[PDB]
C-alpha cells in the first residue's frame, strides 16, 4: 500500500577515484535503451501472482 516513499534510484557502490563509472554507466544506458532492464523484468521480476 501507499506510494513510492522517497523516490530514488538503485545505484552501485563506487568509490570516487574509480575510473569505471564511465563505461559501466554507458552499459546502464544500454540496459535501459535495449531493455536489459526489461530482460531482468522477464527473467526475475514478472512471474507470480495471487
Amino acid at each position: 500500500t501507499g506510494e513510492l516513499f522517497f523516490r530514488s534510484g538503485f545505484g552501485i557502490g563506487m568509490r570516487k577515484d574509480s575510473p569505471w563509472k564511465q563505461n559501466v554507466s554507458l552499459s546502464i544506458l544500454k540496459s535501459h535503451e535495449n531493455g536489459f532492464m526489461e530482460d531482468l523484468d522477464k527473467t526475475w521480476v514478472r512471474y507470480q501472482e495471487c
Binding site: 513510492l4 522517497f6 538503485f10 563506487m14 544506458l29
Partner: peptide
C-alpha cells in the same frame, strides 16, 4: 565494489558516488 540495489543517498554520495541507477523506485 558494492554490487547491490543501493538506494541513492545524498550523504552516501558525499563519500561513495553512484553510477547511473537501475530502478527509479521508493519505499512501500
Amino acid at each position: 565494489m558494492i554490487v547491490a540495489p543501493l538506494t541513492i543517498n545524498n550523504e552516501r554520495a558525499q563519500y561513495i558516488e553512484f553510477s547511473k541507477p537501475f530502478k527509479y523506485q521508493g519505499l512501500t
